Design a protein around this ligand. Structure first.
Ligand SMILES: *C/C=C(C)/C=C/C=C(C)/C=C/C1=C(C)CCCC1(C)C
Length: 137
């Protein structure tokens, strides 16, 4: 697996619907969909250690984890969570999340490197799955 690279988004499906499940009101959902059309993901992978920087026009966030080791990040709508990533196959990993405080939809994400050289991210809230596709810059 070489997830390492600078990835730029080419497709985003069901992102508004995901944010809706997560309780974001309609005007902000539209504004967020618009910010997603631009966004980039930078990955540095060494073995099962990952560094990920996600950036839009005005905001940037870093995720650091090792596969199989609990870490803390935030859900899509911004609520702090405990996360745990496991491999599902050679080139796909899955992250399950648990809220630090309170309750809400069951969230997760996956990241896959396809044979055609695309990165596929999925983000899930309950029954709704957002799929985003990236290519290397
Ligand atoms: C492996 C890559 C991951 C886990 C990327 C996660 C990216 C997000 C959770 C970004 C979500 C966004 C918003 C919450 C609002 C603006 C649009 C996005 C897509 C940057």
């Amino acid at each position: 697996p070489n997830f390492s690279g600078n990835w730029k988004i080419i497709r985003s499906e069901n992102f508004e619907e995901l944010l809706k499940v997560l309780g974001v009101n309609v005007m902000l959902r539209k504004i967020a969909v618009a910010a997603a059309s631009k966004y980039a993901v930078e990955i540095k992978q060494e073995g099962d250690t990952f560094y990920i920087k996600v950036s839009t026009t005005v905001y940037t966030t870093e995720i650091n984890f090792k596969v199989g080791e609990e870490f803390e990040e935030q859900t899509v709508d911004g609520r702090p969570c405990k996360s745990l990533v496991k491999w599902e196959s050679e080139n796909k990993m899955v992250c399950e999340q648990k809220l630090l405080k309170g309750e809400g939809p069951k969230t997760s994400w996956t990241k896959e490197l396809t044979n055609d050289g695309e990165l596929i991210l999925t983000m899930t809230a309950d029954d709704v799955v957002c799929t985003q596709v990236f290519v290397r810059e």
